[PDB]
Amino acid sequence: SGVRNLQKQVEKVLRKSAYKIVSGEAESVEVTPENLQDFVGKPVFTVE
Amino acid sequence: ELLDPEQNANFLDHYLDVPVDLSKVLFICTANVTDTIPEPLRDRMEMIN
């Protein structure tokens, strides 16, 4: 019910993007859902 | 207060009142199992295995 957990996720995605900028390849990371599983890994819950 | 990404930058403790600025520190933490750790602490950090 809280938004704290999504706040952790989006943090993680951003900071990985920071690594992709300053040293990584892309000068402009473009997250896409197909890309997403890279950054935040594979889905954990689905079958509510 | 240590592990808060923003509030580590102005950490203070009762002994020496003066705020410290830990923002540049690269903390690391080690736990044998990820389940016992309480949720508010456990939810921030990545759990590599």
Curated annotation (Swiss-Prot), chain A:
Q: Which domain of life is it from?
A: Eukaryota
Give the tissue specificity.
Duodenum, heart, lung and liver, but not thymus.
List where this protein forms a coiled coil. Answer: none
Where in or outside the cell is it found?
Answer: Mitochondrion matrix
Transmembrane ranges?
A: none
What this chain does, per the entry, is described as: ATP-dependent serine protease that mediates the selective degradation of misfolded, unassembled or oxidatively damaged polypeptides as well as certain short-lived regulatory proteins in the mitochondrial matrix. Endogenous substrates include mitochondrial steroidogenic acute regulatory (StAR) protein, DELE1, helicase Twinkle (TWNK) and the large ribosomal subunit protein MRPL32/bL32m. MRPL32/bL32m is protected from degradation by LONP1 when it is bound to a nucleic acid (RNA), but TWNK is not. May also have a chaperone function in the assembly of inner membrane protein complexes.
Its domain comment says: The Lon N-terminal domains are crucial for the overall structure of the protein, maintaining it in a conformation allowing its proper functioning. The AP-domain (ATP-binding and proteolytic domains) has a closed-ring conformation in the presence of AMP-PNP and its N-terminal entry gate appears closed. Upon ADP binding, it switches to a lock-washer conformation and its N-terminal gate opens.
What's the subunit arrangement here?
Homohexamer. Organized in a ring with a central cavity. The ATP-binding and proteolytic domains (AP-domain) form a hexameric chamber, while the N-terminal domain is arranged as a trimer of dimers. DNA and RNA binding is stimulated by substrate and inhibited by ATP binding. Interacts with TWNK and mitochondrial DNA polymerase subunit POLG.
Similarity field: Belongs to the peptidase S16 family.
Annotated disorder: CODAS syndrome: A rare syndrome characterized by the combination of cerebral, ocular, dental, auricular, and skeletal features. These include developmental delay, craniofacial anomalies, cataracts, ptosis, median nasal groove, delayed tooth eruption, hearing loss, short stature, delayed epiphyseal ossification, metaphyseal hip dysplasia, and vertebral coronal clefts.
Name recorded for this polypeptide: Lon protease homolog, mitochondrial
The organism is Homo sapiens
**Gene this protein is translated from:** LONP1
Curated annotation (Swiss-Prot), chain B:
The name this protein goes by in its record: Lon protease homolog, mitochondrial
Q: Which disease is it linked to?
A: CODAS syndrome: A rare syndrome characterized by the combination of cerebral, ocular, dental, auricular, and skeletal features. These include developmental delay, craniofacial anomalies, cataracts, ptosis, median nasal groove, delayed tooth eruption, hearing loss, short stature, delayed epiphyseal ossification, metaphyseal hip dysplasia, and vertebral coronal clefts.
| Superkingdom, taxonomy of origin | Eukaryota
Task: Give the location in the cell.
Answer: Mitochondrion matrix
Question: Which family does this protein fall into?
Answer: Belongs to the peptidase S16 family.
| Assembly behavior | Homohexamer. Organized in a ring with a central cavity. The ATP-binding and proteolytic domains (AP-domain) form a hexameric chamber, while the N-terminal domain is arranged as a trimer of dimers. DNA and RNA binding is stimulated by substrate and inhibited by ATP binding. Interacts with TWNK and mitochondrial DNA polymerase subunit POLG.
Domain annotation text? The Lon N-terminal domains are crucial for the overall structure of the protein, maintaining it in a conformation allowing its proper functioning.
Q: What does this protein do?
A: ATP-dependent serine protease that mediates the selective degradation of misfolded, unassembled or oxidatively damaged polypeptides as well as certain short-lived regulatory proteins in the mitochondrial matrix. Endogenous substrates include mitochondrial steroidogenic acute regulatory (StAR) protein, DELE1, helicase Twinkle (TWNK) and the large ribosomal subunit protein MRPL32/bL32m. MRPL32/bL32m is protected from degradation by LONP1 when it is bound to a nucleic acid (RNA), but TWNK is not. May also have a chaperone function in the assembly of inner membrane protein complexes.
Task: Provide the tissue specificity.
Answer: Duodenum, heart, lung and liver, but not thymus.
